[PDB]
Design an enzyme around this catalytic site. Structure first.
Site, PDB file in Angstrom:
ATOM      1  CB  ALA C  43      -0.968  -0.002   1.177  1.00 24.46           C
ATOM      2  CB  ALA C  44       0.060   4.640  -1.386  1.00 28.97           C
ATOM      3  NE  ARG C  45      -1.975   1.572   4.059  1.00 25.93           N
ATOM      4  CZ  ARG C  45      -2.559   0.619   4.776  1.00 25.93           C
ATOM      5  NH1 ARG C  45      -2.593   0.703   6.098  1.00 25.93           N
ATOM      6  NH2 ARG C  45      -3.116  -0.418   4.167  1.00 25.93           N
ATOM      7  CE1 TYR C  46       1.109  -1.730   3.857  1.00 28.61           C
ATOM      8  CE2 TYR C  46       1.682  -0.110   5.519  1.00 28.61           C
ATOM      9  CZ  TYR C  46       0.901  -1.164   5.096  1.00 28.61           C
ATOM     10  OH  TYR C  46       0.014  -1.602   5.827  1.00 28.61           O
ATOM     11  CB  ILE C  47       6.211   1.623  -1.632  1.00 31.93           C
ATOM     12  CG1 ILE C  47       4.916   2.150  -2.258  1.00 31.93           C
ATOM     13  CG2 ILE C  47       6.125   0.115  -1.425  1.00 31.93           C
ATOM     14  CD1 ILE C  47       4.467   1.365  -3.473  1.00 31.93           C
TER      15      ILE C  47
END
Lengths: 94, 49, 49
Positions: C43-47
């Site tokens: 998910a975007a909040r990760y990468i």
DNA sequence: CGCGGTAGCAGTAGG
DNA sequence: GGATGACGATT
DNA sequence: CGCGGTAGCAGTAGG
DNA sequence: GGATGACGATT
């Protein structure tokens, strides 16, 4: 979906309706104050080229404060548009 | 997650009876109604503040 | 929606064989693998990129 | 933390 | 020989 | 476009 | 008299 799944349904005149909303909202701030709601690009453009310079204003791209929605419904006959019952070359185009 | 934060914002903005006596943010859009306690609200890409 | 855009970015970044001959963005994290064609991705909040 | 639905086209694969 | 599915940006 | 799972506490309501 | 659920920031 209506024309395909239900035969003869779109033949009934005044069955399918459309609720439309103004494309932009203009606010006049310094000179005098009112607000202009445009339904389309051509109107807003003719005004933008033939009136805008006469005021200080702000254009809002078309969520709208519910109190304006109440207005949308108070006279909804202006925002309501009716589709014409199938005619020649309607099905063909569909 | 940015999701939780977005929800925090929406919460700060809600203006239906029974939410915030003084909403520090303005609910410029479908920030939910009294019908479901703000749960109705629309997605972040929708509403502004 | 910002979701579609985030996915566009992830797509621009992916660096597993068979994706981008030259990734214009760097996949700083789990930007997916060859195991599922980038679908694994996080998910975007990760990468980051 | 995560899962699911639909459009739209060209061609490939599965029965 | 008709059907289902992959791919991707957007609801 | 949308749906779902879990923690953690205090008190209220439902059988 | 025990169980289930609401509320909210986070996975």
């Amino acid at each position: 979906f209506l024309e395909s799944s239900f035969p003869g349904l779109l033949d009934i005149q005044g069955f399918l309706l459309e609720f439309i909303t103004p494309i932009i909202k203009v606010s006049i701030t310094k000179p005098t104050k009112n607000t202009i709601a445009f339904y389309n690009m051509p109107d807003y453009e003719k005004w933008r080229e033939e009136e805008s310079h006469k005021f200080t204003w702000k254009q809002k791209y078309y969520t709208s404060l519910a109190q304006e929605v109440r207005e949308y419904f108070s006279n909804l006959d202006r925002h309501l548009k009716i589709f014409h019952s199938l005619q020649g070359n309607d099905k063909d185009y569909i | 997650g940015e999701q939780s934060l977005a929800q925090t914002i929406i919460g700060l903005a809600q203006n239906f009876v029974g939410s915030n006596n003084i909403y520090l943010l303005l609910p410029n859009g479908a920030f939910g109604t009294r019908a479901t306690g703000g749960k109705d609200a629309a997605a972040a890409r929708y509403i502004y503040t």
